DNA sequence: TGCCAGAGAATGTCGGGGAGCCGAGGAGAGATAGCT
């Protein structure tokens, strides 16, 4: 009826989160929030791993 | 190994200590009106 969805995109050193409260049956929904957490690696580690 | 920290290169600004001007009280130098 009312659904809580937590979408996570986990990169090499980045984490994107999105929490949303939605109602699919009525095509009704609002976004609770989203954010990005960045773990700082230099480009050398990205090209080396 | 990409990128961080700092060397490196052009500027512009400012103390600072001599150079050179230059305002100012004061002394020769005299025309001169009060005096004889």
Nearest-5° Cα angle at A16, A14 to A13: 10
Say whether the CB atom of A4 is under 7 angstroms from strand B: no
Q: How was this structure determined?
A: cryo-EM
**Distances from the Cα of A48 to the Cα of A8, A13, A34, A38, A42, angstroms:** 25, 13, 30, 19, 10
In residues, how long is chain A?
49
- Looking at strand B, which nucleotides approach a protein CB closer than 7 A? 1-4
Through-space separation of residue A13 CA and nucleotide B5 C1' in angstroms? 25
Q: Is the CB of A47 under 7 A from strand B?
A: yes
């Amino acid at each position: 009826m009312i659904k809580n969805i937590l979408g996570l995109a986990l990169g090499t050193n980045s984490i994107g989160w999105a929490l949303v409260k939605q109602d699919f049956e009525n095509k009704q929904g609002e976004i609770l929030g989203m954010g990005s957490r960045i773990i700082p690696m230099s480009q050398d580690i990205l090209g080396d791993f």
